[PDB]
PDB file of C-alpha atoms (C1' of nucleotides) in Angstrom:
ATOM      1  CA  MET A   1      47.635  64.190  34.568  1.00 29.08           C
ATOM      2  CA  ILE A   2      50.505  66.282  33.133  1.00 31.91           C
ATOM      3  CA  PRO A   3      53.986  66.436  34.763  1.00 31.57           C
ATOM      4  CA  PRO A   4      56.119  69.589  34.229  1.00 34.20           C
ATOM      5  CA  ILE A   5      58.997  68.354  32.038  1.00 36.91           C
ATOM      6  CA  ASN A   6      56.632  66.368  29.778  1.00 33.79           C
ATOM      7  CA  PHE A   7      54.723  69.635  29.258  1.00 34.95           C
ATOM      8  CA  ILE A   8      57.954  71.372  28.132  1.00 35.60           C
ATOM      9  CA  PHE A   9      58.697  68.419  25.823  1.00 35.49           C
ATOM     10  CA  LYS A  10      55.509  69.282  23.896  1.00 33.50           C
ATOM     11  CA  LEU A  11      56.784  72.846  23.323  1.00 34.79           C
ATOM     12  CA  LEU A  12      59.837  71.450  21.463  1.00 33.79           C
ATOM     13  CA  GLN A  13      57.931  69.284  18.972  1.00 32.90           C
ATOM     14  CA  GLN A  14      55.224  71.863  18.233  1.00 35.23           C
ATOM     15  CA  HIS A  15      57.823  74.674  17.945  1.00 35.47           C
ATOM     16  CA  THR A  16      55.310  76.956  19.685  1.00 32.19           C
ATOM     17  CA  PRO A  17      56.152  80.609  20.467  1.00 36.45           C
ATOM     18  CA  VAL A  18      56.705  81.054  24.203  1.00 38.05           C
ATOM     19  CA  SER A  19      57.343  84.125  26.364  1.00 40.20           C
ATOM     20  CA  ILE A  20      59.615  83.744  29.409  1.00 39.11           C
ATOM     21  CA  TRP A  21      59.511  85.872  32.573  1.00 39.00           C
ATOM     22  CA  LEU A  22      62.524  86.593  34.810  1.00 38.08           C
ATOM     23  CA  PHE A  23      63.092  86.009  38.535  1.00 36.65           C
ATOM     24  CA  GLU A  24      63.490  89.421  40.193  1.00 36.02           C
ATOM     25  CA  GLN A  25      62.700  91.575  37.147  1.00 35.91           C
ATOM     26  CA  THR A  26      59.092  92.232  36.068  1.00 33.56           C
ATOM     27  CA  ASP A  27      60.181  95.092  33.770  1.00 36.35           C
ATOM     28  CA  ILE A  28      61.828  92.535  31.436  1.00 37.27           C
ATOM     29  CA  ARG A  29      60.475  89.477  29.632  1.00 34.32           C
ATOM     30  CA  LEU A  30      61.588  87.311  26.697  1.00 34.35           C
ATOM     31  CA  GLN A  31      60.201  85.402  23.687  1.00 36.04           C
ATOM     32  CA  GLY A  32      61.199  82.722  21.143  1.00 37.44           C
ATOM     33  CA  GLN A  33      60.785  79.111  20.022  1.00 41.94           C
ATOM     34  CA  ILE A  34      62.219  76.195  22.043  1.00 44.00           C
ATOM     35  CA  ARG A  35      64.843  73.957  20.386  1.00 41.92           C
ATOM     36  CA  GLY A  36      66.163  72.115  23.447  1.00 42.07           C
ATOM     37  CA  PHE A  37      66.562  72.002  27.225  1.00 39.09           C
ATOM     38  CA  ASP A  38      67.986  69.845  30.058  1.00 34.58           C
ATOM     39  CA  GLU A  39      67.494  68.507  33.628  1.00 34.89           C
ATOM     40  CA  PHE A  40      68.481  71.830  35.274  1.00 34.07           C
ATOM     41  CA  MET A  41      65.888  73.823  33.258  1.00 33.80           C
ATOM     42  CA  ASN A  42      68.317  75.649  30.950  1.00 34.08           C
ATOM     43  CA  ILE A  43      66.727  76.573  27.614  1.00 31.38           C
ATOM     44  CA  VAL A  44      67.964  77.203  24.059  1.00 30.80           C
ATOM     45  CA  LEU A  45      65.572  79.755  22.531  1.00 30.96           C
ATOM     46  CA  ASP A  46      65.509  80.528  18.805  1.00 32.42           C
ATOM     47  CA  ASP A  47      64.480  83.899  17.337  1.00 34.98           C
ATOM     48  CA  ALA A  48      64.287  85.240  20.896  1.00 32.15           C
ATOM     49  CA  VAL A  49      63.059  88.793  21.506  1.00 28.82           C
ATOM     50  CA  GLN A  50      63.506  91.117  24.497  1.00 25.15           C
ATOM     51  CA  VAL A  51      60.224  92.815  25.484  1.00 26.59           C
ATOM     52  CA  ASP A  52      59.386  95.419  28.168  1.00 25.32           C
ATOM     53  CA  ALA A  53      56.380  97.149  29.788  1.00 25.54           C
ATOM     54  CA  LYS A  54      56.925  99.906  27.189  1.00 26.97           C
ATOM     55  CA  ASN A  55      56.721  97.141  24.529  1.00 23.75           C
ATOM     56  CA  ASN A  56      60.277  97.850  23.327  1.00 26.91           C
ATOM     57  CA  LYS A  57      60.739  94.764  21.144  1.00 25.39           C
ATOM     58  CA  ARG A  58      64.516  94.313  20.760  1.00 26.46           C
ATOM     59  CA  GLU A  59      65.962  91.373  18.761  1.00 28.61           C
ATOM     60  CA  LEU A  60      68.749  89.051  19.957  1.00 27.75           C
ATOM     61  CA  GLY A  61      69.192  85.798  18.013  1.00 26.51           C
ATOM     62  CA  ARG A  62      69.591  82.234  19.293  1.00 25.55           C
ATOM     63  CA  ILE A  63      70.353  82.395  23.032  1.00 26.33           C
ATOM     64  CA  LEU A  64      70.585  80.265  26.190  1.00 28.35           C
ATOM     65  CA  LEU A  65      69.141  81.009  29.655  1.00 30.28           C
ATOM     66  CA  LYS A  66      70.030  79.691  33.113  1.00 30.07           C
ATOM     67  CA  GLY A  67      67.296  77.733  34.912  1.00 30.60           C
ATOM     68  CA  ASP A  68      67.790  79.760  38.113  1.00 28.38           C
ATOM     69  CA  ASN A  69      66.269  82.911  36.591  1.00 26.45           C
ATOM     70  CA  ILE A  70      63.010  81.631  35.078  1.00 27.41           C
ATOM     71  CA  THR A  71      59.576  82.009  36.686  1.00 25.80           C
ATOM     72  CA  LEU A  72      56.854  81.466  34.050  1.00 24.10           C
ATOM     73  CA  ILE A  73      56.828  79.579  30.762  1.00 20.53           C
ATOM     74  CA  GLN A  74      53.605  80.280  28.819  1.00 19.83           C
ATOM     75  CA  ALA A  75      52.229  79.106  25.463  1.00 21.47           C
ATOM     76  CA  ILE A  76      51.625  81.801  22.799  1.00 25.14           C
TER      77      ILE A  76
ATOM     78  C1'   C B   1      82.538  50.156  59.708  1.00 28.64           C
ATOM     79  C1'   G B   2      83.797  55.314  61.448  1.00 25.86           C
ATOM     80  C1'   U B   3      85.160  58.857  65.275  1.00 23.81           C
ATOM     81  C1'   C B   4      86.352  60.165  70.674  1.00 22.85           C
ATOM     82  C1'   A B   5      87.447  58.437  75.884  1.00 21.40           C
ATOM     83  C1'   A B   6      89.212  55.025  79.216  1.00 21.20           C
ATOM     84  C1'   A B   7      92.257  50.774  80.135  1.00 18.03           C
ATOM     85  C1'   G B   8      97.889  47.174  79.061  1.00 18.49           C
ATOM     86  C1'   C B   9      95.268  42.500  76.861  1.00 19.34           C
ATOM     87  C1'   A B  10      93.706  37.367  76.670  1.00 14.66           C
ATOM     88  C1'   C B  11      93.973  33.140  79.861  1.00 14.18           C
ATOM     89  C1'   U B  12      94.243  31.748  84.928  1.00 15.97           C
ATOM     90  C1'   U B  13      94.909  31.140  91.318  1.00 18.25           C
ATOM     91  C1'   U B  14      93.266  32.636  95.901  1.00 19.45           C
ATOM     92  C1'   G B  15      90.979  36.256  99.334  1.00 21.86           C
ATOM     93  C1'   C B  16      86.546  39.221 100.428  1.00 20.79           C
ATOM     94  C1'   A B  17      81.496  40.594  99.520  1.00 22.67           C
ATOM     95  C1'   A B  18      76.854  39.958  97.770  1.00 21.72           C
ATOM     96  C1'   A B  19      72.583  36.950  94.635  1.00 21.81           C
ATOM     97  C1'   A B  20      62.985  37.525  94.556  1.00 21.29           C
ATOM     98  C1'   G B  21      63.647  45.005  95.148  1.00 21.57           C
ATOM     99  C1'   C B  22      57.274  44.362  90.207  1.00 19.68           C
ATOM    100  C1'   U B  23      55.350  36.155  90.759  1.00 20.42           C
ATOM    101  C1'   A B  24      59.982  33.648  89.812  1.00 17.15           C
ATOM    102  C1'   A B  25      64.020  27.792  86.736  1.00 16.29           C
ATOM    103  C1'   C B  26      70.583  31.727  91.551  1.00 15.23           C
ATOM    104  C1'   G B  27      70.532  24.757  89.950  1.00 14.59           C
ATOM    105  C1'   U B  28      65.629  23.105  82.989  1.00 12.12           C
ATOM    106  C1'   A B  29      69.991  19.104  88.345  1.00 10.84           C
ATOM    107  C1'   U B  30      68.689  16.912  93.136  1.00 10.81           C
ATOM    108  C1'   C B  31      70.351  14.277  98.506  1.00  9.93           C
ATOM    109  C1'   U B  32      70.770  13.729 104.043  1.00  9.13           C
ATOM    110  C1'   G B  33      69.579  15.483 108.749  1.00  8.37           C
ATOM    111  C1'   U B  34      67.070  18.042 113.320  1.00  9.14           C
ATOM    112  C1'   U B  35      62.254  19.553 115.659  1.00 10.18           C
ATOM    113  C1'   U B  36      56.847  19.419 115.773  1.00 10.16           C
ATOM    114  C1'   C B  37      52.714  16.738 114.241  1.00 11.53           C
ATOM    115  C1'   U B  38      49.989  13.178 111.922  1.00 10.76           C
ATOM    116  C1'   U B  39      49.337   7.890 109.881  1.00 12.53           C
ATOM    117  C1'   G B  40      52.263   2.649 108.607  1.00 13.28           C
ATOM    118  C1'   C B  41      54.921  -2.251 110.307  1.00 14.29           C
ATOM    119  C1'   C B  42      55.917  -3.109 115.248  1.00 11.93           C
ATOM    120  C1'   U B  43      57.479  -4.104 120.676  1.00 12.01           C
ATOM    121  C1'   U B  44      64.146  -3.752 122.241  1.00 10.98           C
ATOM    122  C1'   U B  45      65.614   1.812 121.365  1.00 10.99           C
ATOM    123  C1'   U B  46      68.196   2.413 117.089  1.00 14.17           C
ATOM    124  C1'   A B  47      67.435   1.277 112.064  1.00 13.08           C
ATOM    125  C1'   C B  48      62.875   2.182 109.027  1.00 16.24           C
ATOM    126  C1'   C B  49      57.147   3.117 105.934  1.00 15.23           C
ATOM    127  C1'   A B  50      55.135   8.021 103.752  1.00 14.85           C
ATOM    128  C1'   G B  51      52.541  12.728 104.125  1.00 12.28           C
ATOM    129  C1'   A B  52      52.578  17.818 106.567  1.00 13.41           C
ATOM    130  C1'   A B  53      54.613  22.361 108.567  1.00 12.26           C
ATOM    131  C1'   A B  54      59.410  24.866 110.730  1.00 11.40           C
ATOM    132  C1'   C B  55      64.107  25.005 110.405  1.00 10.85           C
ATOM    133  C1'   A B  56      69.170  23.260 108.946  1.00  8.67           C
ATOM    134  C1'   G B  57      73.384  21.079 106.364  1.00  9.36           C
ATOM    135  C1'   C B  58      75.792  19.277 101.879  1.00  8.34           C
ATOM    136  C1'   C B  59      77.013  18.887  96.262  1.00  4.42           C
ATOM    137  C1'   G B  60      76.977  23.046  92.781  1.00  8.14           C
ATOM    138  C1'   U B  61      75.906  28.224  89.800  1.00  8.16           C
ATOM    139  C1'   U B  62      76.361  33.754  88.906  1.00  3.66           C
ATOM    140  C1'   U B  63      78.185  38.730  89.799  1.00  2.00           C
ATOM    141  C1'   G B  64      81.366  42.666  91.683  1.00  2.00           C
ATOM    142  C1'   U B  65      85.671  43.701  93.778  1.00  4.51           C
ATOM    143  C1'   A B  66      91.200  42.952  95.654  1.00  2.61           C
ATOM    144  C1'   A B  67      95.635  40.801  95.100  1.00  2.62           C
ATOM    145  C1'   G B  68      98.350  37.581  92.378  1.00  2.00           C
ATOM    146  C1'   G B  69     100.231  33.583  88.502  1.00  2.17           C
ATOM    147  C1'   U B  70     101.351  31.982  82.663  1.00  4.49           C
ATOM    148  C1'   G B  71     101.688  33.952  77.509  1.00  7.37           C
ATOM    149  C1'   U B  72     102.123  38.267  75.032  1.00 10.76           C
ATOM    150  C1'   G B  73     102.718  43.482  74.219  1.00  8.97           C
ATOM    151  C1'   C B  74     104.464  48.206  77.722  1.00  7.90           C
ATOM    152  C1'   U B  75     109.002  52.087  69.988  1.00  8.03           C
ATOM    153  C1'   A B  76     102.251  48.048  70.575  1.00  5.34           C
ATOM    154  C1'   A B  77      97.889  44.818  70.908  1.00  3.93           C
ATOM    155  C1'   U B  78      93.295  44.046  72.858  1.00  3.26           C
ATOM    156  C1'   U B  79      89.218  45.115  75.392  1.00  5.55           C
ATOM    157  C1'   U B  80      85.574  48.495  77.082  1.00  2.42           C
ATOM    158  C1'   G B  81      82.397  52.457  76.776  1.00  2.00           C
ATOM    159  C1'   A B  82      80.444  56.939  74.585  1.00  2.00           C
ATOM    160  C1'   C B  83      78.604  59.697  70.228  1.00  2.00           C
ATOM    161  C1'   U B  84      73.534  65.299  67.220  1.00  2.00           C
ATOM    162  C1'   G B  85      78.440  59.437  62.214  1.00  2.00           C
ATOM    163  C1'   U B  86      78.714  60.526  55.442  1.00  2.00           C
ATOM    164  C1'   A B  87      81.020  64.727  51.196  1.00  2.00           C
ATOM    165  C1'   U B  88      75.858  67.777  47.618  1.00  2.00           C
ATOM    166  C1'   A B  89      78.743  74.566  43.863  1.00  2.00           C
ATOM    167  C1'   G B  90      72.812  73.503  38.998  1.00  2.00           C
ATOM    168  C1'   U B  91      65.215  74.819  42.222  1.00  2.00           C
ATOM    169  C1'   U B  92      63.255  73.657  49.938  1.00  2.00           C
ATOM    170  C1'   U B  93      68.808  75.568  54.295  1.00  2.00           C
ATOM    171  C1'   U B  94      76.424  76.034  53.926  1.00  3.82           C
ATOM    172  C1'   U B  95      79.465  78.754  47.326  1.00  5.34           C
ATOM    173  C1'   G B  96      74.276  84.253  47.970  1.00  5.64           C
ATOM    174  C1'   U B  97      68.839  88.248  44.057  1.00  7.31           C
ATOM    175  C1'   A B  98      73.023  90.601  45.591  1.00  6.16           C
ATOM    176  C1'   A B  99      74.425  95.590  45.080  1.00  8.85           C
ATOM    177  C1'   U B 100      72.859 100.571  45.303  1.00  9.64           C
ATOM    178  C1'   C B 101      69.973 105.001  45.927  1.00  9.86           C
ATOM    179  C1'   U B 102      66.139 108.298  47.972  1.00 10.40           C
ATOM    180  C1'   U B 103      62.030 110.240  50.851  1.00  6.50           C
ATOM    181  C1'   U B 104      59.149 110.273  55.529  1.00  8.35           C
ATOM    182  C1'   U B 105      59.293 110.503  61.562  1.00  9.06           C
TER     183        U B 105
END
RNA sequence: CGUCAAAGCACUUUGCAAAAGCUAACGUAUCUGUUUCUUGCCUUUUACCAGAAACAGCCGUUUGUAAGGUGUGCUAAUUUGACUGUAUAGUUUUUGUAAUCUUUU
């Protein structure tokens, strides 16, 4: 079987593009490649992009998120 | 170990009460006597032989309680009880996703 942090470890090596959803905000989402992370589920995204229901793709740069705000992490 | 409560504390002397509550050594010990019966050895009764049942004494044991004694402390020490006793800002409770607005009855 596949534990959750070992699954995220694969997303670092493969450098796969991953879109991230927020806690109490469906209107907003994010994108980017995963460089690194930690035990508390904080993430360092590279070439991250802010997306909406309108599809308003707005660029950001290399950012960091708090683990308290995530909900879904999905491949491609 | 920690908290709280009570109390002097440890050691000791007497007094006074108790000690099958659901089959169990108040004493991992153990002796004498009385009465009533049964058998022994016997004729003087006592003194005795060795079984029973029913009562008694004696040598001891434990507990609670009361007053004391010695040594120590009453600017402390010790005992005794009681307790829902631990420390976590990063995902399942105590360091917040909250804040704010509007319509309906």
